[PDB]
Design a protein around this ligand. Structure first.
Ligand SMILES: CC[n+]1c(-c2ccccc2)c2cc(N)ccc2c2ccc(N)cc21
Lengths: 36, 150, 48, 150, 50, 390, 100, 50, 50, 41
């Protein structure tokens, strides 16, 4: 239970956030381009 | 001990009692309120634990049969079956994590032949980690087994 | 680049955080290698 | 017999002075009991061999060996691998041919204990009850009426 | 040889047992360790060896 | 939020769990007996065999052996619980078993008995816990040292954001001192050799020789019937022979008087020490408590010194912040990709914190690595979002 | 002087009890002779170091050392590496200046 | 041996640490060969002998 | 050699190739041992092996 | 024998040893000769 409760939490919140909504897209935009 | 004037023989029985008693009465064990004595084996700083306790029964296997009438063995406070169980609960999660992957693999890859490549990928990667950590000195520890699963 | 740096263990937390990265670090190279030899082969050989 | 203050500075202190010049070490400790039983403990750097580390402590103890009471020399001096934690604790009782918590303690320590301690890197065996010993119970009045001492 | 023997007799610690012994008697309430001779402490105490 | 979800989350080492096997030790007041202590091991075996049949498969009591050391004061009962299926509920599980058990021993008893999960961890490293030790450095003695620890244990309890501190086990029971008037002895005509091995071979025991018993050579011992060595009045019974072929009582040359010694004298690192097993405050945690304990030992008298996740992660992860960037330009050379992936770190990690902060979980070892794996998949995911679109 | 029954349980048995807590081991043995000469033999797992394996047996023997007859203590106690098999057996004789 | 050379008789306790008791003689009675005569030993017949 | 020692003698003498092999492992050969486990003695054990 | 009287004492080697000789062959006999025809030649 100590293993998965830590991972499950981080994984749900990794993907459903990353792939969509927040960075993991918004990054490359303002990192590769922004100013250089 | 002596022989007093009138040749009266003083023995060790006369001056003192003689029974075959314990060497140390300071400690006394009662298995569930019944008189008894056991063995409390302690580990040797860096010993193999489960393998040592397997050989506790191995040496003791040949003592069992030559016991007198009534003398039985019985097992309280024992580590062994906890080793047995954590292995069986982790290897359970291993097969569950395969089967469960196999369903998500079919749900997306409608091809059954395609629900087979990844299914038949990690079986081999696990075994390699047994072959790598054995080659580096580690064991099937409580830790390395969650590392198989994780 | 996050496992093996933290696999630099310490004291009674020795084989603790050690065996932690390594076990799976071992598994990562074996996962990559399999995904460079087998998963390729198998996939090419027979996928559809 | 020796009390808490006796063992503390005729066995304990004698070794603590003659317990140096050893490789890998952070501290030592001691417990000088009133029963008449001292036991020292040296903890080493992590990863250090317990095979060599024993030798060193037990081959320097054996220079203050003849600096001790002679009751102590013939008594049990030991150097072993500690692991404050049992695992297999095999209780042994009787059901049919009844025997006391002393009859068992002897047969346990006169058939099995000798073997187990040796068997598969067992650091040290603990004994519950005690092995037999030709016990004598000197009556003091009976010594006087013939005119004698212990 | 008499001076030596006087220090190997008076200047010593002796193993005296205890009340409520290892095998006591059923019903005793006390258990206390006996003290006997003590290893001497000061220069004055060595001055008074008989 | 992420930060607050992490700083406030307490830090353990490894979760203590039901093992189907636990234990519990006994400790009587000063100078108890084998008959008095055995009464308590009968009461403890009865809480287990009548008020815990469901759970307890088999106990295994032991009178005269504490895990402090030994003596007729001490005790211990090895429990062996039934298998885990037959023992289903949370009450059936060891967390709850050592709860009402400990509560009953502090209720219907008059000594000190506990009960505990066998720390599945190592003996050391409880987390939010201690191991202090009070050394006497100068030429002071056991008696002056005792007062110093009474002032240390008093100052912590006087003003504990608290602490919970207690001694280890030097109860400090009295001893029956026997002074032998030397001059008196030699006037009556007795060797002091003969007087010593009377008292030693009567009250204490003496390893005389070895004899053979059914093959195996064992030991011959000599002492006395118990009744003639139970109280201080029984010293007079023993009459020793004098040079002039006639008996002599103890009372003649003897002196009878009690004293205050201690039944165990610990010695840490070549010097006399008394160990102190305290714990971190209910609020504070080790580094705080420890540091708020060195200042209390430094306020004690002269000639009285002392000696005692992990700091681990801070550095460990520091190298996780260097190898990433290098490996994130070992295929993605730019200084644009090496800052992409960087942000998926707390993208996932926030949820890992949250799931364990929601349930009873803590920041132990499995979680600290459940973070690392969460970050590895965070990179994975991202790098594909990058590598492909580049 | 000691006969076959004497050495068997005043030197032999005293060590056999005080000969435990050792790493790598499958059995032990003994030969208590009538000349007054006992000699024990412990055989270990194959590949085990004979350097360390000696130490262990000979540093535990040396706890039952003061449990022995004093004639035996001043006599030759030894712990060595066995190899029931000679190789060089250099005979030394005399020809001219005769000796027994 | 116990006059000119020294003799490890026993041990005594000094401020905690157990040290050694030694026995020899004031220096002046063991400096030259003429000082050997000073030492008189007891004989079986309860009287001194040079 | 073995034939002559079993011919013109009255004791027991053999002769053998020094097993170039190890002491152990003759093949088609044994090493049994008869333990007395219980509290019997050397004399009762002798009859068991007989 | 009577009560209280116990006891204690190519190679089995080849059987297993050669068993792995039957596995590594076939694998190495298709590590260059992939078919299932050469691995039986
Ligand atoms: C730590 C011993 N040690 C060293 C080693 C490290 C530092 C100096 C000398 C040797 C080692 C060095 C190299 N290259 C490759 C493998 C190993 C190894 C492998 C397994 C093991 N169980 C210990 C090992």
């Amino acid at each position: 239970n100590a293993v998965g409760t830590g991972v499950m939490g981080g994984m749900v919140t990794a993907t459903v956030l990353a792939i969509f909504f927040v960075p993991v897209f918004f990054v490359v935009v303002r990192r590769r381009f922004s100013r250089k | 001990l002596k022989v007093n004037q009138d040749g009266s023989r003083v023995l060790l029985r006369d001056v003192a009692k003689i029974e075959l008693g314990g060497e140390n009465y300071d400690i006394i064990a009662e298995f569930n309120g019944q008189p008894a004595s056991g063995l409390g084996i302690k580990l040797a700083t860096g010993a193999n634990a489960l393998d040592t306790a397997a050989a506790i029964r191995a040496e003791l296997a040949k003592m069992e049969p030559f016991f007198p009438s009534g003398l039985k063995i019985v097992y309280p406070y024992d580590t062994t079956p906890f080793v047995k169980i954590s292995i069986h609960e982790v290897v359970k999660t291993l097969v569950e994590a395969i089967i469960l992957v196999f369903l998500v693999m079919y749900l997306f890859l409608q091809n059954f032949r395609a629900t087979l490549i990844p299914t038949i990928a990690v079986p081999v990667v696990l075994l390699g980690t047994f072959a790598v950590l054995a080659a580096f000195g580690f064991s099937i520890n409580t830790l390395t087994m969650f590392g198989m699963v994780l | 680049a996050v496992f093996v740096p933290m696999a630099f263990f310490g004291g009674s937390t020795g084989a603790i955080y050690r065996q932690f990265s390594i076990t799976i670090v071992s598994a990562m190279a074996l996962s990559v290698l399999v995904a460079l030899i087998l998963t390729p082969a198998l996939c090419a050989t027979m996928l559809k | 017999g020796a009390d808490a203050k006796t063992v503390q500075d005729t066995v304990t202190q004698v070794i603590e002075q003659n317990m140096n010049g050893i490789d890998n070490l952070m501290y030592m400790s001691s417990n000088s009991d009133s029963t008449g039983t001292v036991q020292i403990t040296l903890t080493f750097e992590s990863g250090t061999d317990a095979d060599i580390a024993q030798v060193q402590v037990q081959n320097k103890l054996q220079l203050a060996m003849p600096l001790l009471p002679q009751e102590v020399q013939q008594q049990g001096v030991s150097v072993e691998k500690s692991s404050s934690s049992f695992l297999m604790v095999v209780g042994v009782i009787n059901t049919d041919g009844t025997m006391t918590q002393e009859d068992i303690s002897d047969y346990v320590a006169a058939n099995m204990k000798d073997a187990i301690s040796r068997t598969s890197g067992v650091g040290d065996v603990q004994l519950f009850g005690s092995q037999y010993a030709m016990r004598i119970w000197m009556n003091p009045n009976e010594l006087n009426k013939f005119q004698l001492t212990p | 040889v008499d001076v030596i023997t006087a220090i190997k007799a008076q200047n010593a610690q002796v193993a005296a047992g205890q009340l409520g012994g290892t095998p006591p008697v059923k019903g005793q309430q006390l258990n206390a360790s006996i003290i006997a001779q003590t290893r001497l402490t000061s220069t004055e105490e060595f001055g008074k060896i008989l | 939020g992420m930060a607050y979800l992490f700083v406030r989350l307490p830090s353990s080492f490894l979760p203590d769990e039901d093992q189907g096997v636990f234990m519990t030790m006994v400790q009587l007041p000063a100078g108890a007996t084998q008959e008095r202590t055995q009464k308590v091991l009968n009461e403890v075996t009865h809480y287990y065999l009548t008020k815990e049949k469901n759970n307890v498969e088999s106990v295994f009591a032991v009178n005269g052996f504490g895990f402090a050391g030994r003596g007729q004061n001490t005790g211990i009962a090895f429990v062996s619980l039934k298998d885990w299926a037959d023992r289903p509920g949370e009450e059936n599980k060891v967390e709850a078993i050592t709860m009402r058990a400990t509560r009953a021993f502090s209720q219907i008893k008059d000594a000190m008995v506990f009960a505990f999960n066998l720390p599945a961890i190592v003996e050391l490293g409880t987390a939010t816990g201690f191991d202090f030790e009070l050394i006497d450095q100068a030429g002071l003695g056991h008696e002056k040292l005792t007062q110093a620890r009474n002032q240390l244990l008093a100052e912590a309890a006087k003003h504990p954001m608290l602490t919970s501190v207690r001694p280890n086990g030097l109860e400090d029971t009295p001893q029956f001192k026997i002074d032998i008037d030397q001059e008196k002895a030699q006037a009556l005509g007795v060797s002091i050799n003969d007087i010593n091995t009377t008292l030693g071979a009567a009250w204490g025991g003496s390893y005389v020789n070895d004899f053979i018993d059914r093959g195996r050579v064992k030991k011959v011992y000599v002492m006395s019937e118990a009744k003639y060595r139970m109280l201080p009045d029984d010293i007079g019974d023993w009459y020793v022979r004098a040079a002039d072929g006639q008996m002599v009582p103890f009372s003649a040359f003897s002196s009878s008087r009690w004293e205050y010694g201690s039944p165990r004298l610990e010695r840490y690192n070549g010097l006399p020490s008394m160990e102190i097993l305290g714990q971190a405050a209910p609020g504070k945690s080790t580094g705080e408590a420890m540091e708020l304990m060195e200042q209390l030992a430094s306020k004690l008298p002269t000639g009285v010194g002392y000696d005692w996740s992990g700091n681990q992660a801070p550095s460990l992860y520091a190298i996780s912040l260097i190898v990433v960037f290098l490996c994130l330009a070992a295929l993605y050379e730019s200084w644009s990709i090496p800052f992409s992936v960087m942000l998926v770190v707390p993208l996932g990690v926030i949820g890992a914190l949250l799931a364990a902060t929601f349930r009873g979980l803590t920041n132990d070892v499995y979680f600290q690595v459940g973070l690392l794996t969460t970050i590895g998949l965070s990179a994975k995911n991202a790098i594909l979002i990058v590598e492909f679109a580049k």
